[model samples]
Target: GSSGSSGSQPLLDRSIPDFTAFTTVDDWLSAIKMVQYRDSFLTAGFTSLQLVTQMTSEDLLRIGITLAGHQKKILNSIHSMRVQISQSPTAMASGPSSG
Candidate 1:
């Protein structure tokens, strides 16, 4: 199904000179090493979504969704962040600070 978004093609052209998927733990770790060479925008997006549920219009200026590259990176980062958050919060208790 289509995601109703336009943000993957540009990424293939600009930065992803090559690509591959890792199904093995060793292969995954080895592949992840080159991730440091990627842009820092991924970390920025993950932190912003974690810290602020509401983003001011001015904040949008810097992290605007006008570009496919920007949206793709942010979406990927947010996806990874959501997965981590979901898996790590399964044992929270019914208390004020259980999490």
Candidate 2:
């Protein structure tokens, strides 16, 4: 029953659920309508949101995404979403406000 300063919660329970809804690579592929490469990502251990953020163009190519356009699209989507999350006040807010 510890009340942290300014009502700040422990980090262990922190999670960006809205930004991490995919449980598998196939889930991500379906969301982006790129199911053709679903198996490729799964095989390469890219089955989680954490893994997806770590992906690079070369990694995508090595995983069989030969089309540069598709690579750019996927990468851009990931990057933009990350930017959005980083810029969101709710996402970065550390404690409950009294106001």
Candidate 3:
């Protein structure tokens, strides 16, 4: 019985892009290598990355994300962005912290 210390590590390593630097949705898309759809976001009324955090399959359809891999890339990136923004403490502009 020489099967000792053979532990397996399961992975769910989720990584996020540095798209936060790009304030404009267009720029963010560019950062993610999808500059082709840069104009589509604006035309579809996704004027800000803030709105981008709420995209759905239907929204993608509207913006012509008909390609499968492209849709996944955008969806994955946006979801990561959604969580980051959600966890962010941005009540400063509205007035006092969560009181």
Top of the candidates by TM-score = 3
Tens-place lDDT per residue, model 2, 1-99, is 877557565566343334455556677677778888888888887777566765678888898898988987678656655554434334556668855
Q: Over the stretch 1-99, how does candidate 3's per-residue lDDT look in tens digits?
A: 867675788776577567457677888888889888998899989989888887786788887888888988888778878877745555448656555
Error of 2 at 74 (Å): 0.9
Candidate 2's TM-score: 0.57
Backbone clash pairs in model 2 (N, Cα, C under 3 Å; residues 3+ apart or in different chains), count: 0
lDDT of 3: 0.80
TM-score-superior candidate, 1 or 3: 3
Q: What TM-score would every model get versus the actual structure?
A: 0.27, 0.57, 0.67
For each candidate in the order shown, give its overall lDDT on alpha carbons. Answer: 0.39, 0.69, 0.80
Model 2 RMSD in Å is 18.7
Candidate 2 C-alpha error for residue 77, in Å: 1.7
For this target, which candidate reaches the highest lDDT against the unseen true structure?
3
- Higher TM-score: candidate 2 or 3? 3
Score residue 35 of candidate 1 by CA lDDT: 40
> Any runs in candidate 2 off by more than 4 Å, and if so which?
1-21, 84-99
lDDT of 2 at 50: 61
